[PDB]
Amino acid sequence: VKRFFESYHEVPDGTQCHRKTYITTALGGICGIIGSAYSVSLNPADSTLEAVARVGRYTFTAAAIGAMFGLTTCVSAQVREKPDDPLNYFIGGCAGGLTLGARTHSYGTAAMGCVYMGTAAALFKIGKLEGWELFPTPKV
Amino acid sequence: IRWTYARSANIYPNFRPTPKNSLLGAVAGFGPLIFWYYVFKTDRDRKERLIQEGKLDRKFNISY
Amino acid sequence: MPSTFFNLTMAFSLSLLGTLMFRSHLMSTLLCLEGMVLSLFIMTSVTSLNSNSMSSMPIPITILVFAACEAAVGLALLVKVSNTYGTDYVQNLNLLQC
Amino acid sequence: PFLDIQKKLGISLDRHFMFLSAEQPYKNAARCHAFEKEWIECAHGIGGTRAK
Amino acid sequence: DGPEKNYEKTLAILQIESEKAELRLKEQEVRRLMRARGDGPWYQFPTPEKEFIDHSPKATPDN
Amino acid sequence: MMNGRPGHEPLKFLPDEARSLPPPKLNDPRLVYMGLLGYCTGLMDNMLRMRPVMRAGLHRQLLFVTSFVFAGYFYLKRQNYLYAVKDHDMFGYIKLHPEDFPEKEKKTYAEILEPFHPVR
Amino acid sequence: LLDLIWLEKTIPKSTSTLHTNMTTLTTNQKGLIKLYFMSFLINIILIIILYSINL
Amino acid sequence: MNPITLAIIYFTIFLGPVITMSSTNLMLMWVGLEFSLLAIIPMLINKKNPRSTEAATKYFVTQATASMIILLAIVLNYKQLGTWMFQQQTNGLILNMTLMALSMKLGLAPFHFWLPEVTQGIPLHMGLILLTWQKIAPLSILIQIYPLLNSTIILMLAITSIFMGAWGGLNQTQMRKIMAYSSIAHMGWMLAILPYNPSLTLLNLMIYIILTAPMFMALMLNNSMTINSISLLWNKTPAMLTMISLMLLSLGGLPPLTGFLPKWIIITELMKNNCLIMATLMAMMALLNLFFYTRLIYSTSLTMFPTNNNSKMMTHQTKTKPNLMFSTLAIMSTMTLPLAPQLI
Amino acid sequence: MLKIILPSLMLLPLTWLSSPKKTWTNVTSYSFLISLTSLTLLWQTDENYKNFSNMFSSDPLSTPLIILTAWLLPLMLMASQNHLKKDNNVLQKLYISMLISLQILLIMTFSATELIMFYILFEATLIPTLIIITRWGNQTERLNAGIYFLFYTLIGSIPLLIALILIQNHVGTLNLMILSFTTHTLDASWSNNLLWLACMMAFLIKMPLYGVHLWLPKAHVEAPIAGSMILAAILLKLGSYGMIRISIILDPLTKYMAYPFILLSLWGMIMTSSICLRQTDLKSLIAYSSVSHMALVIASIMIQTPWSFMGATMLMIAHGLTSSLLFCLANSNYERIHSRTMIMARGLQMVFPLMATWWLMASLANLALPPSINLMGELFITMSLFSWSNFTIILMGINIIITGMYSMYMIITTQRGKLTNHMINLQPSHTRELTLMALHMIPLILLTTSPKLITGLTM
Amino acid sequence: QLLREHWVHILVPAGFVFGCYLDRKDDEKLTAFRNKSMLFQRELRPNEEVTWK
Ligand SMILES: CCCCCCCCCCCCO[C@@H]1O[C@H](CO)[C@@H](O[C@H]2O[C@H](CO)[C@@H](O)[C@H](O)[C@H]2O)[C@H](O)[C@H]1O
Ligand SMILES: CCCCCCCCCCCCO[C@@H]1O[C@H](CO)[C@@H](O[C@H]2O[C@H](CO)[C@@H](O)[C@H](O)[C@H]2O)[C@H](O)[C@H]1O
C-alpha cells in the first residue's frame, strides 16, 4: 500500500532510522526494477541468464543507492541537532552518488552523481517544508 | 605558433584528473574563498555586535 | 451479466497482451488484433441486449465493418512485406533503425 | 464536440442516439428510461461541475 | 515643456499600471472560484442534451 | 473557458453583440504591423523565386498587404469582442458574489510597523 | 590548473558529457517492433499500477 | 496514383479528422480515427520500396492497437453510463486508458519509438501530413474531455516526452528523424498544458504546425534529408538560408521569435496553477532543442560547407518550386510576437 | 524615446536602399546624428525621472547607457569598414543590418519599463551577437565560442523567466515603478532564497562571475572587432543594469545572500588580473581585464551603498569606453600582422608614433589614472567595500598593483622594445583607425571634465 | 535625376519627425491628471486652456 511509503514522513528525520532506511531501500529497488525491465525489453541480452543477471545488478545497485541515502540522511539528522535542514538530504544524496560511483567503478560518476543527487534530495526536502506541490490539480 | 597552441588548446585534451590534480585544484580554488569568508564574516559580525550595543561610535560617517 | 463482462474483459486483455508481445509471424499478431475485435463486439452486443437499447445496436455492426476494413489493409501490408523479404517474419522489419 | 458544425447548421447527424432515453424503434423505451430522463433534466442548465 | 508634464504624466502611468495589476489579481481570484464552484459563466463543462429525449407514450406503461 | 458562457452562439465569428463596441481605428499600430508583415512577405516571395526584390510583382505585393490588413481588421475586431466579453463576465460575477471578493480596507503607513533592515 | 582545466571540466564539459551519455543511452534503439511493443506493455503495466496505488 | 484514387484517398484523409471533431458520439470519433488510419497508409506505401513497406507496417500495427484500446474505453463507458460520451462520473481507469491510447496515437513518449522510424521511412510530402494533420483529431478527442483528465499521468507523459525528444534530437543526423523528435517535444508541451487550459494547447498546436509546414516544404525544395545535404543550400539556393535560420531558431523557442510565445504562455499558466517543478524542468530541458537546432543553423546558414563540382549545373538550371504559402507561413510564424495578445 | 527608436529602425531601410558606393557613408553619418538626437535624454532638470509612455522610460541610470549605445554604433561601423573590405555587397549590408538591429534592441532594453519587456529584449541580443561571432569570425573555434556564449546565457536566463513569472503572479504587475513603490520585505524561507538566486543568476552570468566567466575569453578571441566592442561595452553591462533594477524587491535577503558572490568577485578579480600577467593573446588579456573590472562592479552592486551604486555606474561607463578602445587598438595591429600573440609584434612605437600615444592613453585609463572616471569609480567602490569590511583593502590593493602591472606590461611588450624589423607589411596608420581611437578617447576626457552626468540614481 | 538615389536621404529625418509626432500622441493619451495633482495643481491663468498641453 502507499501507506508504507507515506510513513517515511510520519516522524521527522533523525528518528526511526531503520524504518526510513527500509523505505528508501524499497523505493530504490522499485526504481531499479523498473529501469531494468525497460533495459531488458529494449536492448536485449544474448542469454536469459544474462538478462536475469542484468535485472539483479540494476535492482541491487538502485537498492544500495536508496539504502545509503536513507541511512546517511537519518544519521546526519540524528548526530547533528537539525532535524529538517536540507543540508542533511544533500549529504544523503551525495552519499548515494558516491555509492553509485563505487558500484560503477568510476570517480567521475561519483562526483557528478554526488552533486546532482544531493541537489535533488535537498530540493525535495525544501519542497516538503515549504509546501511545494508536484503534479498539482487544476486550480486556475 | 607551436608554443601558443601548446599553452592554449592542447591543455585540456592533454589533461587527466589525478589525486594530486584534484586536491590541488579543489584547494587552490575553494580554500582561499573559505578563508576570506571567515575573515569577512567574523569582522562584520563583530561590527554588527558592537553597532547593536552602541559601543561603536560613528562620529562623522555621513556617506557610507 | 457481471461474470460475463468480467470474462469478456479478461479475454480482451489477453488478446491485447498477445498483440503487444510478438512472436515472429506478423499474421499471428493480426489474428490477435482480430480477436480483440471479436471481444469488443461481443461486449457491445451484450450491453445493448441487456439494456434493451435498440438504438445502439447499429453500432456493433459499424465496429465489425471498420474492423474488417482495417484487417483487409493489414493483409495487404502483409502481402507487400512478403513480396519484399520472402517471409512475413517481423525480424526483417528492422531497416529503419538507421 | 470540438467544433459544433451540427448545432451551427441545425442538423442532427449523431446527437439523437447518445443515451438510453432517446427515441427507440417502435417506441420501446430502454431500461431505466425514467431514471435517465430524471438525471438529464436535473443536470440541464447547471454546469457539469455543479451537476456532479 | 517643464516639470508638470513629466510629473503628472507619471501620475497617469501609475494609475494605469496599478489598476491593471489589481484587475489581473482579481482575474486570478475569479477564475479560481468559478473553476472550483461551477457557478459562473466560465468553466461550464457540457452535459448531455435534454431536447433529444423521447417523451411520447411508450409501448410499456411503466417507462 | 469561455465556451460555455450563457448565450454563446456556436461558430459565429463576430456575434451581433459585438457591434456595440468601438470598432478598430484603421490606422491602428496592429493593423499597420499587419501591412508591414504583408509587404515583407511579398518581398520574401520575390527573393525566394529569384526576382527583383522590390521592383517585381507589384500587383502581388499590393494583394499581400491588402489581404493582411483585411484579415487583421476582422480578427482584431473579434479579439476585442472576446476580451470585452471576458471583462463583462468578470465584473458581473464579482458584483454577484460580494462575499467571496470582499473589499480590503487599507491602513495608512503611519500605523504599519514595517521592519527596518540596516544595509551596513 | 583552475581556469583552463578544472572550471571547464566542472561546469561546461561535465554537462556536455552527461548529455552525450544520455543521448547515446536513449537514441540507440535496435529498431524492432517486438521490443518496442514490449516497452509499450511495460507502460501499460506501470499506468495500471499507478492508478491502483494512488486509488 | 490515378486521379480518382487521389481524390478519394485525400478526401478521406480530410474527412476522418473532420468527423472526429464534429462528432458528438464517441463511436463516431473512433470512426474518424479509423478513417485517418486506413486512408493514410496507401499514401505512405506509395513508393513501394523496402523501407516504405516496413514504415507502413509499423504505423499500421501501432495505430490499430491504439484504436482498439480507445474502443475498449468507449465500450466500457457505455457499459457503465448507458451513453456514448465521457461524463464526470465515468470510471477513472477508462479515462486513463483513453489518455494512454491517444498518447500512443499521437506518438508521445514513452510510446514514441514508432514515430521516428515511420517519419524516416516515409517521404517528406507525407511526413508533413503525418506530423501536422494527423494530430488534430486525437488532440481534439482529448480536449473534448479535458476537465476529466489526470494531472499526474498527463504531466508524467509530457515531461517524459520533453526529456526524450530533447535527448533524441542530438544524436540524429537525419532531418526526418530530427523533425520527428521535434514533434515529440512540442506535443509534450501541448499535453502538459492540456488539463489546465486547452486554449493554449490549441495555440501551441497552431504555432507548431505553422512552423513545421514551412520547414518541411523547405526540405522538399531540394529533397534535402541529411545535415550534409542541407549544408549545400548556400550553393543550390542561397536565398532561403535567412528564413531557414529564423525558423529553426523559432522552433527552438528564442524570445524575439514567435516560438517563445507558446512556451512562455504555457509556463505562465502552469505557474498560475502552482506547477513550479514541472514548469522549471520542462523549460530547462527545452534548451537541448535549441542546441540541436543551432547545430543545423551552423551547418546551413552561418558556415559554408564543401560543395561538389556537379552543383554548377543545378545552378545553371532554373527553379520554380517554392510556393506562396512558404513565404506566408514562414514570415507569419517567425515575425508575429508583437501581435501575441491577439493570439491568446 | 520613440524619437530615438524610430530613426534607428529607419537606418535599416537606408542601409538596404542605399547605393553600394554610398551605403557606408550614409549609415555612418545618420548613425552619428541619431547619437546626437539621443542627448535629449540629458535634460533632466528635476528629480522626477522621465517616463515617455506606458512602455518606455529613462532614468539617471539608463540615460548614460542609452547614450553610450547610440555612440558605439558609428564607431562599430568604422571598425568594421575594413575587415569587410572584400565581401559581397549583400553580405556587407547584412553585417550593417546586424549592428543596427543590435543598437535598436539594446536601446529598447535599457529603456524598458516592464521586466518582461526586459527579459525578451535582453535575450533577443543573443541572435545578432551569435551571428556576428559565428559568421564573420576568423578562426575555426568561433562555432564553439558561439555555443558557449549562447548557452551560458540561456541557462542563466530560464530561471530568470520562472522567477519573473512568480513575481508577476504574486504582485500583479511587473512595471518597475510599481514594484519600487509597493515593494515589501521578503522572509528568509528556503523558497525565497531560491528565488533570490533565480532572479540574480542570469545577470550574474552576464556579468561573468569568477566561476562562470569562461565564455568571455572564448567569445572575444573568436569574435570580430565590432562584436567584441559591442559585447564588452554594452552586453556585459546588461547584467549590471538588470541587477540594479531588480534588487529593489529582493530585500532584505541580500544581507546574507551576497556573501558568496561578494567573495567570488573579490577573489576572482585577483585571480583574473593575475592571469593577465602571463597570457600570450592580446585579445584574451583585454578580456580578462574586463572580467576583473566586472568583478569589482558586482561586489559594489551586491553591497548596495550609495557609493557602491554610483561608483559602479561610473565604472560601468568608463570600462565600456576603455575596453572598446583597447580592442580597437589590438584589432588595428591584427589587421596588419594577422596574429593575436602579444610577443610577436614589438617596438611598434618606432613605426606608429601616434597610435603609440593612443595606446598609452588607453593603458592609463585601464590602470585607473586620476582624475579619470575609471579611477573615480574604482576609488568609490573601494570606499564602499572598505566600509562594508575594513579587510577588503588587502584584496583591493593587490588587485590595484596587478592591474597597473599588466596594463604597463602590454605597453612595454608591444609599443616599446626593438622593432621586429622583419615585419615588412606594417603600414602607416589609417585615418580611419586614428579617428576611431580619437572618438573613443574624447568622450572619456569630456566626461572626466563633467562626471555629474554619469553618476547613478543615488548620487 | 540624382533624386534616383538621393531620395533615400529622407528616410532617417522622416524617422525623427514621425517619432516626435508619435511621442506627442503618447502624451495625448495620458491626459488625466492634467491639472489634478497635489503639487502643481493650480487655477488656470486668464486666457488659458491647457496647463501643459
Ligand atoms: C550554472 C549554469 C550555467 C552553466 C552552463 C554550462 C553549459 C555550457 C554548455 C557548453 C557546451 C558546449 O559543448 C561543447 O561541444 C563541443 C563540440 O564542439 C566540445 O568540443 C570538444 O569535444 C571533445 C572534448 O570532450 C573533443 O573530442 C572535441 O574535439 C572538442 O571539440 C566541447 O568540449 C563542449 O564543451
Ligand atoms: C540542464 C540542461 C542544460 C542543457 C544545456 C547544455 C547543452 C549541452 C549540449 C550537449 C551536447 C554537446 O555536444 C558535444 O559534442 C561534442 C562533439 O561535437 C562531443 O565531443 C565529442 O568529440 C569527439 C567527436 O566529435 C570525440 O572524440 C569525443 O570523445 C566526443 O565526446 C561532446 O561530448 C558533446 O558534449
- Which residues of chain I lie closer than 8 angstroms to J8, CB-CB? 13-14, 17-18, 26
What's the distance, Cα to Cα, between the start and end of chain E in Å? 84
Residue pairs between chains E and I whose CB atoms are closer than 8 Å: 42
- Which residues of chain J lie closer than 8 angstroms to E15, CB-CB? 32-33
Residue H327 dihedral angles phi and psi, to the nearest 5°: -60, -45
Do residues J20 and E1 touch, judged by C-beta distance below 8 A? no
Q: How far is D41 from chain H (nearest CA, A)?
A: 15
CA I408 to CA G18: how far, in whole Å?
43
Cell numbers 470510471: residue: H91
CA I158 to CA A118: how far, in whole Å?
22
CA C8 to CA H14: how far, in whole Å?
35
Number of Cα atoms under 13 Å in the Cβ half of residue D39: 17
Ligand 1 proximity of I149 Cβ (cutoff 6 Å): no
Q: How far is CA C71 from CA C64, F66, H46, H61, I149, in A?
A: 10, 51, 19, 11, 55
Number of Cα atoms under 13 Å in the Cβ half of residue A67: 13
Q: Ligand 1, from I130, I140, I147: best to mutate by most atoms within 8 Å of Cβ?
A: I147
Chains E and I touch (3+ CB pairs under 8 A): yes
CA F21 to CA I156: how far, in whole Å?
44
Q: Are residues H61 and G33, on separate chains, in Cβ contact within 8 Å?
A: yes
- Which residues of chain H lie closer than 8 angstroms to I150, CB-CB? 290, 294
Residue H165 alpha carbon to ligand 2 centre in Å:
17
- Non-local (6+) Cβ contacts of I246 within 8 A are I115, I199, I200, I203
**Number of residues in chain E:** 63
I335 touches chain F (CB under 8 A): no
Q: Give resolution in angstroms.
A: 3.9
- Which residues of chain C lie closer than 8 angstroms to D30, CB-CB? 51-55
Give the residues across from F86 on adjacent strands: none
How many CB atoms are located within 10 Å of the residue I208 CB?
24
Q: How far is CA H144 from CA A102, B53, I66, in A?
A: 51, 68, 51
Residue I114 dihedral angles phi and psi, to the nearest 5°: -115, 135
CA I265 to chain centre: 17
Crossing angle, helix H241-252 and helix H287-297, to 10 degrees?
170
CA I407 to CA I399: how far, in whole Å?
12
Q: Which of residues 1-60 of E touch H (CB under 8 A)?
A: 28, 43, 45, 47-48
CA B22 to CA B16: how far, in whole Å?
10
Closest-CA residue to H93 (of H79, H77, H113): H77
For residue C94, give the C-alpha cell.
528492422
> Does an H or E element contain C71, and which?
helix C58-85
For residue J15, give the C-alpha cell.
524617422
Ligand 2 proximity of G21 Cβ (cutoff 6 Å): no
Number of Cα atoms under 13 Å in the Cβ half of residue I104: 18
CA H129 to CA E21: how far, in whole Å?
43
For residue A34, give the C-alpha cell.
523498473
Burial tier of I240 (Cβ tally within 10 Å: 0-12, 13-18, 19+): buried
Number of Cα atoms under 13 Å in the Cβ half of residue B13: 6
D7 touches chain H (CB under 8 A): no
Q: Where are the beta strands (DSSP E) in B1-64?
A: none
Give the residues across from H83 on adjacent strands: D19
- Non-local (6+) Cβ contacts of A90 within 8 A are A118, A119, A121, A122
Closest-CA residue to H120 (of I83, C95, F6, I334): C95
Query: Which residues on chain E place their C-beta less than 8 Å from a C-beta of chain I?
Result: 3, 6-7, 9-10, 13-14, 16-18, 20-22, 24-25, 28
DSSP letter at G9? I
Print the SS3 string covering chain I. Answer: CHHHHHHHHHHHHHHHHCCCCCHHHHHHHHHHHHHHHHHHHHCCCCCCCCCCCCCECCCCCHHHHHHHHHHHHHHHHHHHHHHCCCCCHHHHHHHHHHHHHHHHHHHHHHCECEHHHHHHHHHCCHHHHHHHHHHHCCCCCHHHHHHHHHHHHHHHHHHHHHHHHHHHHHHCCCEHHHHHHHCCCCCCCHHHHHHHHHHHHHHHHHCCCHHHCCHHHHHHHHCCHHHHHHHHHHHHHHHHHHHHHHCCCCCCCHHHHCHHHHHHHHHHHHHHHHHHHCCCEHHHHHHHHHHHHHHHHHHHHHHCCHHHHHHHHHHHHHHHHHHHHHHHHHHHHHHHHCCCECCCCCCHHHCCHHHHHHHHHHHHHHHCCCCCHHHHHHHHHHHHHHHHCCCHHHHHHHHHHHHHHHHHHHHHHHCCCCCCCCCCCCCCCCHHHHHHHHHHHHHHHHHHHCHHHHCCCCC
Atom of ligand 1 nearest to the CA of I152: 5
For residue H269, give the C-alpha cell.
499558466
Domains in chain C, number: 1
Residue pairs between chains C and G whose CB atoms are closer than 8 Å: 30
How many CB atoms are located within 10 Å of the residue H187 CB?
30
Give the residues across from I114 on adjacent strands: I175
Helix (H, G, I), strand (E, B) or coil at F59: helix
Number of Cα atoms under 13 Å in the Cβ half of residue H114: 29
Residue B33 alpha carbon to ligand 1 centre in Å:
27
Closest-CA residue to A25 (of A53, A54, A62, A57): A62
Do residues I111 and I56 touch, judged by C-beta distance below 8 A? yes
- Which residues of chain C lie closer than 8 angstroms to G44, CB-CB? 20
Helix (H, G, I), strand (E, B) or coil at H31: helix
From the CA of H170, the nearest ligand is 2
Whole-number CA gyration radius for chain G: 19
By residue range, what is the domain housing residue C67? 2-98
Residue G16 alpha carbon to ligand 2 centre in Å:
5
User: CATH number, domain at C53?
Assistant: 1.10.287.3510
Closest-CA residue to I93 (of I142, I24, I164): I24
Do residues I243 and I200 touch, judged by C-beta distance below 8 A? yes
Cell numbers 497508409: residue: H41
Q: Are residues H290 and I169, on separate chains, in Cβ contact within 8 Å?
A: no
- Angle formed at CA I103 by CA I98 and CA I108, multiple of 5 degrees: 125
- Non-local (6+) Cβ contacts of H215 within 8 A are H179, H244, H247, H248, H251
Give the residues across from J34 on adjacent strands: none
Chains E and A touch (3+ CB pairs under 8 A): yes
Do residues I40 and I17 touch, judged by C-beta distance below 8 A? no
Q: How far is H277 from chain G (nearest CA, A)?
A: 20
Give the residues across from H174 on adjacent strands: H226
CA C33 to CA C72: how far, in whole Å?
12
DSSP letter at J45? P
Q: Ligand 1, from I151, I157, I197: best to mutate by most atoms within 8 Å of Cβ?
A: I151
For residue I57, give the C-alpha cell.
522610460
Residue pairs between chains G and I whose CB atoms are closer than 8 Å: 12
Give the residues across from I175 on adjacent strands: I114
Domains in chain J, number: 1
How many CB atoms are located within 10 Å of the residue H182 CB?
25
Print the SS3 string covering chain D. Answer: CCCCHHHHHCCCCCCCCCECCCCCHHHCCCCCHHHHHHHHHHHCCCCHHHHC
How many CB atoms are located within 10 Å of the residue A47 CB?
9
C74-78 long-range Cβ contacts below 8 angstroms, 24+ apart:
C74/C30, C74/C33, C74/H60, C74/H64, C75/C30, C77/H41, C77/H45, C77/H53, C77/H56, C77/H57, C77/H60, C78/C26, C78/C27, C78/C30
Cell numbers 592609463: residue: I364
Helix (H, G, I), strand (E, B) or coil at H226: strand
- Amino acid in the structure at residue H105: K
Do residues H320 and H279 touch, judged by C-beta distance below 8 A? no
- Which residues of chain H lie closer than 8 angstroms to F42, CB-CB? 327
Closest-CA residue to H14 (of H42, H43, H39, H31): H39
- Which residues of chain H lie closer than 8 angstroms to C94, CB-CB? 54
Q: Ligand 2, from G9, G13, G16, G23: best to mutate by most atoms within 8 Å of Cβ?
A: G16
Q: Which residue of chain B comes nearest to G8, CA vs CA?
A: B12
Q: Which residue of chain D comes nearest to H89, CA vs CA?
A: D52
Burial tier of H152 (Cβ tally within 10 Å: 0-12, 13-18, 19+): middle
Do residues H330 and H322 touch, judged by C-beta distance below 8 A? no
Q: Are residues A135 and H156, on separate chains, in Cβ contact within 8 Å?
A: yes
Domains in chain H, number: 1
Which of F116, F117, F119, F120 has the highest number of chain B CBs within 10 A, making it the mutation to test binding with B? F120
